[PDB]
Scaffold this active site. Structure first.
Site, PDB file in Angstrom:
ATOM      1  N   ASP A  61       0.803  -1.132  -0.106  1.00 36.65           N
ATOM      2  CA  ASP A  61       0.100   0.175  -0.205  1.00 36.65           C
ATOM      3  C   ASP A  61       0.817   1.527  -0.091  1.00 36.65           C
ATOM      4  O   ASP A  61       1.714   1.449   1.080  1.00 36.65           O
ATOM      5  CB  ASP A  61      -1.045  -0.009   1.363  1.00 36.65           C
ATOM      6  CG  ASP A  61      -1.778   1.278   1.116  1.00 36.65           C
ATOM      7  OD1 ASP A  61      -1.184   2.096   1.225  1.00 36.65           O
ATOM      8  OD2 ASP A  61      -2.821   0.747   1.619  1.00 36.65           O
ATOM      9  N   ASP A 391      -8.824  -1.715   1.214  1.00 39.66           N
ATOM     10  CA  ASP A 391      -8.719  -1.248  -0.111  1.00 39.66           C
ATOM     11  C   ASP A 391     -10.085  -1.506  -0.887  1.00 39.66           C
ATOM     12  O   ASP A 391     -10.914  -0.669  -1.282  1.00 39.66           O
ATOM     13  CB  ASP A 391      -7.698  -2.122  -0.441  1.00 39.66           C
ATOM     14  CG  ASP A 391      -6.757  -0.597  -0.339  1.00 39.66           C
ATOM     15  OD1 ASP A 391      -6.768   0.406   0.644  1.00 39.66           O
ATOM     16  OD2 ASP A 391      -5.265  -1.051  -1.014  1.00 39.66           O
TER      17      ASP A 391
HETATM   18 MG   LIG Z   1      -5.811  -0.836  -5.346  1.00 42.35          MG
END
Ligand SMILES: [Mg+2]
Ligand SMILES: Nc1ncnc2c1ncn2[C@@H]1O[C@H](COP(=O)(O)OP(=O)(O)O)[C@@H](O)[C@H]1O
Ligand SMILES: Nc1ncnc2c1ncn2[C@@H]1O[C@H](COP(=O)(O)OP(=O)(O)O)[C@@H](O)[C@H]1O
Ligand SMILES: Nc1ncnc2c1ncn2[C@@H]1O[C@H](COP(=O)(O)OP(=O)(O)O)[C@@H](O)[C@H]1O
Ligand SMILES: [Mg+2]
Ligand SMILES: [Mg+2]
Ligand SMILES: [Mg+2]
Lengths: 528, 538, 532, 360
Positions: A61, A391
């Site tokens: 991330d 996410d």
């Molecule tokens: Mg993504």
């Protein structure tokens, strides 16, 4: 320069001014981008960072990676800020935003070096950003049928796409179903605190699970908790904010007696207070008892003898989820324990999950909550699994609120590069170069995909530019074939707001960074 | 890393403004030392010495700085002092003012090359205007030359004794005038030595028709007073010295040691006989003189002086009309020195001094300074150097220019009047450099303690009329006067060199925008200078 | 795993570092390019100051540690050795080629392909210059030389005065002209002497038809002017004769000692007499001259000069017709000096120059020579004038050796950018990109000129490329090739008619050297820096 | 590679890379020696041999883990080595050195790997001509590349390299004014042209001014007789060996040689003597008595050519009875590309040498 007996600023003031300062800002931004480049796309890699405490964090991330880097450059902090802003507003695109901002800066670096006035560059960026944003809103596919099967398909595909970059891609279809099952239970505000994510070390990713109900870890039981039963088949549940134990009736309370009969009356009075609370809780029909506050050993044994279940010190969030799932209310007083305030589930259990003991309330049909229980071989394994699911969950929420999808693999980036090249070929010629540079910058997403995959990004981008100029809007990188493909048919779907906010944030960061012409560092006070 | 850790680099408007401010600071150091009402400065040398002066080059030479622009300004002063020997403060002030009026235009977006082109145009026109307003002078008019020298010493501490210093400088320069083989020459540096004996009074200081050295006779039997001395000068030692080769002797016979020592004595006798053949009265050597040589010269009634400096010997040659010799066997009457009218050796204070001070046609001199102390006499020597250098500049280029700032105002007006036809973008720098020339009158008025605004306005207005190129300031009264009435007339050479140096340094400092500092010398192998081959050259 | 005792950079890291180093070196000098470039101060950690615009000089004074930056410094030095001008442009171009080539390598274009494309583009740019962008100085006459000198002197502290300095430079190169075997005219600069003397303004700098020596007479009794100068150039010293190492004087009869001592000096006397017997009025020697000998010269009315430099002596000899003698010895076993070994000159003077005297040998026969006395405000200006004038002399020499010139003001670079971006389309697909990037890099010269002029680099270079594209696509407008930048007005201009000329060799060698340097640095993909 | 000092090396040679980076591990040092052995035996392939060794060992890793004794492994590698020798010899084809295209292609391949791959069209034919000049293609079984002198000169580009057929010498000319001797007769002398000096401790004892003058006179006469005995043979170019004991060329001898119009080049090194003599056909003269015309070398030209303000070279062009020797002048724009150009050319020459022996 000259000494100047008395100086204007405090000694130690570092002033960087001019074109060199601007180019250095751009270079720092390039560094920040490089720090996250290799995480982009299905062939992206994770980064391991280590803190001063010695605790390692492993993440794909981009927002996380940049938060962990102790970036101090005033111009490079802006990329960190826009990655944070992307993680806030959308939940995906955090790496893409940084890449795009840095690439805008890189593309305008030559013109900046030759004395082009930054106002011109920011004007061009604003123009091209508005154009590309309106074009995304124009060519975004929004199915106007409100069909439920197609609205679940859309969310599942958007979640699979958001997950096809993590260490759970080899089970991403699995997780995508759960993510949808998760957000399709939340009521109308789609609160994230209403989805619980427990991490139980041990087990495989496929051993992970979603409970349409609630689950939480056993909480510091006293003696007699093992004498309690551990499975109930239609329990009524008393959710309380009540301390159930022999305690000082109040901290500012002082008993004063002058008689041993009064002494014994007082002892028995404390005991009767407690036993009265417990008797009210028992007569409400509740076979399971949860308290946000402690439940002492006396109450534990009382409930064990009445064949009830009790758990104290339950965390507030787990209690609120138990409430939203079972369908009751949290009571600080035990004086009105009606069936109106009690909760109910079809099954309550205490089971072993990988070395830990977990209480499961399952069977709640009216559940506005779900609880993820994630398995894995490491603390950071499970932490990155949770981040991946975050996410996917944020993506699914945004899609639920606006099912307007574009295609990925750089399809949208190439389409906007085409549209802006076309637009730039119709304007005087100063803004022409800068908008063409915007267009050339947008190509960093498919290029980086091809790079991280191990292809010849040049040949693939040639194919893409040709195929997008021949007619065709959703053609992007096909990774397993090292080629291009209609990604909208391949189901590489991405909520439009993802790329909209990515372009907006990247353009704002670029405009900001490029508007700064001087940096003045004051010397640190309280030096140490 | 790429460059060294000690390598700093500044660039841009910062560098420009810094160089201009350093120049302005150098100008403010010596701004008050300009004019007839200037004040002295007592500088402290790192050798524990003291320097009291109002000479721009003396001040800037005793100061040390680290900013390269300030270094450039000190080098300006050095250049002006070496070339013309005056104007060392005017040049600095003009360079400072030009750099200031260029700072004005660089604050705006004008490129330094534009300012430089305008400065070069303004310099050309300054030169034209100076040559146009100048006047000639008959160098045979001693009164005219004395006034010219007064106009140069009136600013210095020796202004109290002005007739004296003027006559000294004029006599010295006129004597050291020398032509040989069709080449005129002055050379105040090698001849016209200034010798300052502290004590006495300055009014008894004089220029000798001859020379003076700090030497006594070698033997007390020599004469110390000779009224028509024939003088011989030598570069060779009148001792018996070793040879160039390995001349080891080998003695076996008893008579050989004594014979060798007698051979030495006979060699000395032969040298002194080669000398006495010419019948001199004085013999002067740069090297030593053996005691046996003294014996032989004394028997000949010859007074000998030894261990004289080569420069002093050359001055004695020029004064008494002699040729220095290195082999007495090659001595001729053409080498013997007649022309001296008196050799004396007198005790000044507690020191013996040799005077050759009645010469006819001496092409060298000694200015004997007497005064209160070493510092005061050093200042007098510097002032006398100013006076003599001005006299020389005049004798070379006899064109004269008005002072008191009159020339600066005349040129400023001419440039302002030429600027109207420009109609380009260099007219602003041009008209700035024209109005930067007024810092000379301005500074003058400031040192008087008068009103700069009113006086400079009245003067700028006066200089707009037709026949007013000669009007300037009176630095002792704070008023306006005609220079043909006041008497302050500078040499055209001095003003030309001043303006040229100022403008050229303004140019030099405007072309700088970047400074790289700290890098090492990269040169240690015995200071490599030029040694290398080239491409043929045949 | 390696266990090497050092650090190791590998891949994009070291390539980015090399490009950073080259860019650093180029940004040092970018501000000193063109008529609007400015000079630099350099302070030597001791207060020793050096003002300069010469890129080679700047990069020599710098203290560089990175090898990829030492390469560009050596490049500037090499350009200064082989051409004498272009020392800044070559560095800028090498750095820009490195920048664009590393950009291509980041896109994962292989460095070999970038190198092939750069090599091809260099070859074709050289060919295109030689075929389309050259002007023959024969068609233009002598004003071509003056214009080339002025173009080289623009950007220097003798810029605006170029109108006059160029004449001097041209005269000097014409003066030292000499013809060799094959009858080719050769202009061996470094035979023009350049002396520095702070004082009178630049406009008072002097061209001496003859030679100037930073020397003076040996004795103040000697004359300081001679008219019908007969010159004797000697490569030996005139001192008391000393027997050599393998010779010892051993006396066993004291009666001989005196005579031996006497010869130690009489030998030298005889040599001087022989010289003076021929008529020599001026005697220059690389060695020393004792006072004993100076007296012989004084009595003869001759001018002796000692410790003269060997190269100055060689030049005076070649120019006056003299023969440098290391010994007075003939093929007959005797010692003599012939009057034919003398040189001649219409005058020799000791001239005063700002409290420092020098020697002037004026109007030598058997050849013409040239000296230049630079006159400025201080030593810094004079040193910068010497460097600038050397650049101008080298430029005029190149113009006269190869009679081709090209226009300036970015004209050549703009034309090459156009032609190479059009030509790349035929050569491969990745080498195509490399050639396009070479073309784009070539534009850094007019870009830098415009930036330094404080003008719209983008607009100006776009207009330039427009003019040159019209010239290369419309055969009736090839006369546009001669268009380049006018930095006093910020407008394109016919530079062939304006007089902005540069020797072809300048641009050609700049391209070749920049390309080789870029290839050398662009071939490094690893770096092992060992601990000292 | 920036070594302990500020010495920089840009290289593609495995032997050079390995021996320039101190490795500090016994096995790594053994690999350095391996690359050295390949450079000796073959001259190119020094990276491939190291990679093969590293790969064989990385293979031995898993075998050792399998539990095989590291003596079974060694012998089995010997087995595979003999079989691989067999295989490679089977897939090889013979070649005759008369086949110029095979040699050009070999050299071109050896250079493709390197920095001078761009200037292959120039450096490959020169690298084949060099090895073909210094041998006799028939009956030759090896090549001594010491017969091929490389002369690196900073300046120009790699496109300026040359294959001077005579010899080139960095030693400059002392005779100022006399260069470019045509129809040159060259003499290489190993004796000194200076005042007489015995092998013993000699002295000249003066006791009369007559002796003093006679000393200088007889010295001049000795030196003049020497330069006359040299001139009489027709020699106009004179190479003089380096002498550190006594002056090999007095200024008087230089004056006389100049007046005799003889180009003189001193400081020739005692290691170049065999090379110079093999090149020109001169014979070294150590005693003036044997300095005859039959001890000279006839070249068609001897010039001192300037390298465009980047030094000077003393180049002898043309030589009767030309020797099995050739010189390559290596130009370049920086000392690093020059050094790698030299190494690359050496690789090509060693390829052609690997071709002269074992013609396969
Ligand atoms: Mg993504
Ligand atoms: N299966 C796939 N094939 C091709 N491209 C994909 C695929 N999955 C995702 N992508 C692309 O990869 C990019 C996702 O970047 P990533 O680093 O995974 O998350 P972020 O959105 O934070 O950048 C998007 O451009 C997306 O279109
Ligand atoms: N009595 C005077 N009144 C007005 N101006 C004078 C007078 N005497 C000299 N000046 C002028 O003032 C300046 C004084 O120069 P000075 O202080 O000696 O410094 P320098 O001559 O070294 O520049 C000169 O320009 C001179 O012409
Ligand atoms: N008067 C001029 N007008 C326009 N361009 C010029 C002029 N003089 C020089 N230039 C250009 O500036 C470039 C660099 O010049 P300069 O900096 O003086 O030499 P260098 O690059 O060797 O330092 C040259 O390529 C030339 O084309
Ligand atoms: Mg004065
Ligand atoms: Mg130049
Ligand atoms: Mg190889």
């Amino acid at each position: 320069m000259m000494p100047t007996p008395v100086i204007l600023l405090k000694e130690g003031t570092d002033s960087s001014q001019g074109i060199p300062q601007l180019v250095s800002n751009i270079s720092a931004c390039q560094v920040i981008a490089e720090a996250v480049r290799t995480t982009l796309g299905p062939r992206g890699m994770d980064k391991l960072i280590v803190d001063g405490r010695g605790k390692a964090t492993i993440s794909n991330d981009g927002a996380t990676i940049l938060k962990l880097l102790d970036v101090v450059h005033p111009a490079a902090k802006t990329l960190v800020d826009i990655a944070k802003s992307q993680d806030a507003e959308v939940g995906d695109g955090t790496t893409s935003v940084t890449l795009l901002a840095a690439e805008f800066l890189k593309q305008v670096k030559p013109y900046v070096e030759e004395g082009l006035h930054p106002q011109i560059i920011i004007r061009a960026f604003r123009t091209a950003t508005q154009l590309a944003v309106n074009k995304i809103k124009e060519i975004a596919v929004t199915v106007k049928k409100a069909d439920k099967v197609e609205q679940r398909k859309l969310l599942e595909k958007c979640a699979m796409t958001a997950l096809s970059s993590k260490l759970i891609s080899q089970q991403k279809a699995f997780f995508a179903k759960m993510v949808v099952d998760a957000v399709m239970m939340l009521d109308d505000l789609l609160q994230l605190k209403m989805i619980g994510i427990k991490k139980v070390q041990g087990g495989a990713l496929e051993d992970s699970q979603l409970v349409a109900g609630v689950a939480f870890k056993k909480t510091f039981s006293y003696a007699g908790f093992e004498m309690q039963p551990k499975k109930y088949h239609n329990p009524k549940i008393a959710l309380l904010n009540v301390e159930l134990e022999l305690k000082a009736e109040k901290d500012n309370a002082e008993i004063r007696v002058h008689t041993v009969e009064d002494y014994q009356a007082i002892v028995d009075a404390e005991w009767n207070i407690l036993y009265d609370k417990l008797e009210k809780i028992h007569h409400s029909g509740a076979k399971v008892v949860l308290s946000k506050l402690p439940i002492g050993d006396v109450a534990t044994q009382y409930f064990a003898d009445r064949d009830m279940f009790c758990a104290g010190r339950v965390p507030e969030e787990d209690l609120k989820r138990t409430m939203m799932a079972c369908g009751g209310s949290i009571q600080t007083s035990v004086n009105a324990l009606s069936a109106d305030v009690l909760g109910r589930c079809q099954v309550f259990e205490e089971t072993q999950i990988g070395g830990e003991r977990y209480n499961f309330f399952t069977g709640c049909p009216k559940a506005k909550t779900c609880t993820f229980i994630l398995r894995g071989g490491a603390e950071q394994f499970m932490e990155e699994t949770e981040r991946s699911l975050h996410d996917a969950i944020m993506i699914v929420r945004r899609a639920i609120k606006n099912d307007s999808v574009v295609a990925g693999g750089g399809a949208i980036e190439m389409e906007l590069s085409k549209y802006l090249r076309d637009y730039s070929r119709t304007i005087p010629g100063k803004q022409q170069l800068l908008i063409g540079a915007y267009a050339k910058a947008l190509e960093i997403i498919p290029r980086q995909l091809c790079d991280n995959a191990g292809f010849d990004a040049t040949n693939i981008l040639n194919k893409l530019r040709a195929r997008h100029a021949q007619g065709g809007t959703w053609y992007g990188v096909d990774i397993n074939n090292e080629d291009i493909a209609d990604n909208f048919e391949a189901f590489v779907w991405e909520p439009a707001m993802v790329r909209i906010n990515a372009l907006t944030a990247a353009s704002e960061a670029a405009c900001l960074i490029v508007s700064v012409d001087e940096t003045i560092k004051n010397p640190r006070s309280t030096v140490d | 890393l790429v460059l060294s850790q000690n390598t700093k680099r500044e660039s841009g408007r910062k560098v420009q403004s810094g160089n201009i401010n350093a120049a302005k600071t150098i100008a403010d150091i010596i701004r008050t030392c300009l004019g007839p009402k200037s004040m002295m400065k007592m500088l402290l040398d790192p050798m524990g010495g003291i320097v009291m002066t109002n000479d721009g080059n003396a001040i800037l030479r005793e100061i040390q700085v680290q900013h390269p622009a300030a270094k450039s300004m000190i080098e300006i002063s050095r250049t002006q002092d070496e070339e013309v020997g005056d104007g060392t403060t005017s040049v600095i002030i003009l360079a400072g003012e030009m750099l200031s009026v260029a700072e004005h235009f660089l604050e705006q977006q004008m490129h330094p090359t534009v300012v430089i082109s305008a400065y070069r145009k303004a310099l050309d026109d300054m030169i034209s205007t100076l040559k146009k307003i100048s006047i000639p002078v008959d160098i045979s008019d001693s009164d005219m030359m004395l006034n010219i020298i007064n106009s140069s010493i009136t600013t210095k501490a020796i202004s109290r004794w002005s007739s004296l210093a003027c006559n000294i400088a004029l006599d010295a320069v006129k004597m050291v005038q020398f032509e040989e083989n069709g080449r005129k020459e002055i050379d105040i540096k090698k001849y016209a030595r200034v010798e300052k004996i502290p004590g006495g009074i300055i009014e008894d200081s004089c220029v000798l028709r001859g020379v003076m050295i700090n030497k006594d006779v070698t033997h007390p039997r020599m004469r110390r007073y000779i009224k028509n001395p024939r003088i011989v000068l030598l570069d060779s030692s009148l001792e018996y010295k070793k040879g160039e080769s390995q001349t080891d002797i080998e003695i076996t016979r008893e008579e050989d040691f004594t014979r060798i020592l007698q051979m030495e004595e006979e060699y000395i006798q032969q040298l002194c006989e080669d000398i006495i053949q010419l019948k001199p009265d004085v013999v002067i050597t740069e090297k030593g003189i053996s005691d046996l040589a003294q014996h032989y010269l004394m028997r000949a009634n010859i007074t000998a002086i030894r261990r004289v400096r080569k420069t002093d010997n050359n001055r004695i040659a020029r004064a008494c009309g002699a040729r220095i010799v290195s082999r007495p066997e090659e001595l001729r009457e053409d080498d013997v020195g007649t022309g001296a009218g008196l050799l004396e050796i007198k005790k000044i204070g507690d020191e013996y001094f040799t005077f050759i001070t009645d010469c006819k046609d001496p092409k060298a001199c000694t200015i004997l300074l007497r005064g209160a102390s070493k510092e005061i006499l050093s200042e007098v020597e510097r002032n006398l150097q100013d006076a003599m250098q001005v006299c020389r500049n005049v004798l070379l280029d006899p064109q004269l220019v008005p002072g008191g700032g009159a020339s600066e105002m005349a040129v400023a007006h001419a440039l302002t009047e030429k600027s109207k036809a420009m109609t380009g973008v260099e007219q602003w720098p041009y008209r700035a450099v024209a109005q930067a020339l007024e810092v000379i009158p301005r500074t003058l008025i400031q040192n008087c303690g008068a009103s700069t605004i009113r006086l400079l306005t009245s003067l700028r207005a006066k200089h707009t009329q037709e026949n007013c190129e000669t009007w300037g300031v009176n630095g002792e009264t704070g008023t306006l006067v005609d220079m043909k009435e006041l008497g302050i007339w500078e040499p055209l050479a001095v003003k030309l060199q001043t303006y040229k140096t100022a403008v050229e340094t303004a140019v030099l400092l405007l072309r700088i925008d970047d400074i790289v500092s700290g890098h090492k010398k990269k040169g240690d192998d015995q200071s490599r200078q030029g040694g290398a081959p080239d491409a043929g050259q045949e | 795993p390696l266990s090497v005792f050092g650090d190791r950079s590998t891949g994009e890291t070291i390539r980015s570092q090399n490009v950073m180093a080259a860019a650093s070196i180029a940004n040092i000098v970018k501000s000193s390019l063109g008529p609007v470039g400015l000079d630099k101060m350099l302070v030597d950690d001791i207060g020793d100051v050096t003002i300069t615009n010469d890129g080679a000089t700047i990069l020599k004074l710098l203290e560089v540690e990175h090898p990829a930056a030492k390469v560009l410094c050596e490049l500037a030095d090499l350009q200064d050795k082989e051409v004498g001008d272009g020392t800044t442009s070559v560095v800028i171009i090498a750095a820009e080629l490195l920048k664009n080539a590393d950009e291509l390598v980041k896109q994962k274009i292989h460095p070999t392909s970038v190198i092939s494309g750069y090599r091809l583009a260099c070859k074709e740019a050289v060919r295109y210059i030689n075929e389309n962008l050259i002007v023959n100085t024969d068609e233009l006459g002598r004003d071509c030389l003056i214009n080339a000198a002025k173009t080289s002197m623009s950007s220097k502290i003798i810029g605006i005065n170029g109108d006059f300095f160029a004449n001097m430079v041209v005269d000097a190169v014409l003066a030292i002209k000499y013809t060799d075997i094959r009858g080719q005219p050769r202009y061996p600069v470094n035979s023009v002497n350049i002396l520095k003397a702070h004082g009178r303004s630049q406009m008072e700098s002097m061209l001496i038809s003859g030679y100037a020596l930073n020397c003076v007479v040996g004795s103040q009794g000697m004359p300081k002017r001679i008219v019908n100068a007969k010159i004797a150039c000697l490569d030996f010293s005139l001192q008391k004769t000393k027997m050599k190492l393998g010779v010892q004087v051993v006396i066993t009869d004291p009666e001989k000692l005196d005579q031996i001592r006497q010869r130690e000096s009489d030998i030298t006397k005889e040599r001087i007499q022989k010289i003076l017997a021929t008529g020599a009025n001026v005697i220059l020697t690389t060695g020393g001259i004792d006072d004993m000998c100076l007296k012989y010269f004084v009595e003869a009315g001759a001018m002796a000069v000692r410790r003269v430099l060997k190269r100055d002596l060689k030049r005076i000899a070649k120019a006056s017709g003299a023969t440098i003698l290391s010994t007075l010895a003939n093929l007959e076993g005797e010692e003599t000096f012939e009057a034919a070994m003398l040189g001649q000159a219409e005058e020799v003077v000791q001239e005063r120059i700002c409290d420092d005297e020098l020697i002037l040998i004026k109007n030598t026969k058997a050849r013409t020579s040239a000296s230049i006395i630079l006159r400025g405000a201080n030593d810094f200006m004079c040193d910068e004038m010497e460097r600038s004038l050397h650049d101008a002399l080298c430029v005029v020499k190149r113009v006269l050796e190869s009679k081709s010139v090209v226009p300036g003001g970015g004209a050549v670079e703009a034309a090459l950018s156009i032609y190479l971006e059009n030509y790349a389309t035929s050569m491969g697909s990745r080498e195509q990109l490399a050639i396009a990037e070479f073309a784009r890099s070539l534009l850094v010269i007019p870009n830098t000129l415009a930036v330094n002029a404080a003008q719209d680099s983008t607009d100006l270079v776009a207009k330039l490329r427009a003019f040159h594209n019209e010239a290369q696509v419309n055969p009736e407008r090839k006369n546009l090739k001669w268009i380049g930048l006018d930095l006093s007005n910020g407008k394109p201009r016919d530079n062939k008619q304006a007089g902005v000329f540069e020797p072809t060799i300048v641009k050609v060698k700049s391209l070749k050297f920049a390309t080789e340097a870029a290839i050398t640095i662009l071939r490094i993909d690893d770096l092992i820096k060992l601990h000292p | 590679i920036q070594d302990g000092k500020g010495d920089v090396t840009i290289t593609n040679d495995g032997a050079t890379i390995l021996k320039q980076m101190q490795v500090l591990h016994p096995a790594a040092r053994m690999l350095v020696e391996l690359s050295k052995a390949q450079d000796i035996e073959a001259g190119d392939g020094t990276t491939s041999v190291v990679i093969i060794a590293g790969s064989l060992l990385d293979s031995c890793t898993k075998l050792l883990q399998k539990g095989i004794h590291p003596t079974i492994i060694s012998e089995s590698f010997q087995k595979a080595l003999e079989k691989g020798i067999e295989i490679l010899t089977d897939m090889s084809r013979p070649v005759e050195l008369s086949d110029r295209e095979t040699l050009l292609n070999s050299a071109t391949t050896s250079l493709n790997s390197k920095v001078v791959s761009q200037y292959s069209s120039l450096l490959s034919p020169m690298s084949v001509n060099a090895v073909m000049k210094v041998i006799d293609p028939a009956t030759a079984t090896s090549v001594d590349l010491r017969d091929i002198k490389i002369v690196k000169k900073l300046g120009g580009t790699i496109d300026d390299c040359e294959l001077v057929e005579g010899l080139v010498l960095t030693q400059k000319v002392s005779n100022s004014g006399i260069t470019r001797v045509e129809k040159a007769k060259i003499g290489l002398i190993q004796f000194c042209l200076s005042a007489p000096k015995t092998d013993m401790d000699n002295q000249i004892v003066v006791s009369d001014y007559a002796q003093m003058d006679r000393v200088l006179r007889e010295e001049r006469a000795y030196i003049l007789n020497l330069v006359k005995q040299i001139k009489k043979t027709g020699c106009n170019v004179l190479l003089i060996q380096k002498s550190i004991l006594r002056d090999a060329l007095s200024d008087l001898a230089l004056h006389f040689l100049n007046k005799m119009k003889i180009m003189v080049i001193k400081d020739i090194e005692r290691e170049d003597i065999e090379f110079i003599c093999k090149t020109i056909g001169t014979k070294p003269v150590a005693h003036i008595d044997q300095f005859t015309a039959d001890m000279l070398g006839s070249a068609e030209l001897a010039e001192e050519v300037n390298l465009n303000g980047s030094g000077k070279l003393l180049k002898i062009t043309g030589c009767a009875s030309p020797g099995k020797t050739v010189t390559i002048v290596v130009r370049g724009s920086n000392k690093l590309v020059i050094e790698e150009a030299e190494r690359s050319i050496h690789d090509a020459l060693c390829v052609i040498r690997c071709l002269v022996k074992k013609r396969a």
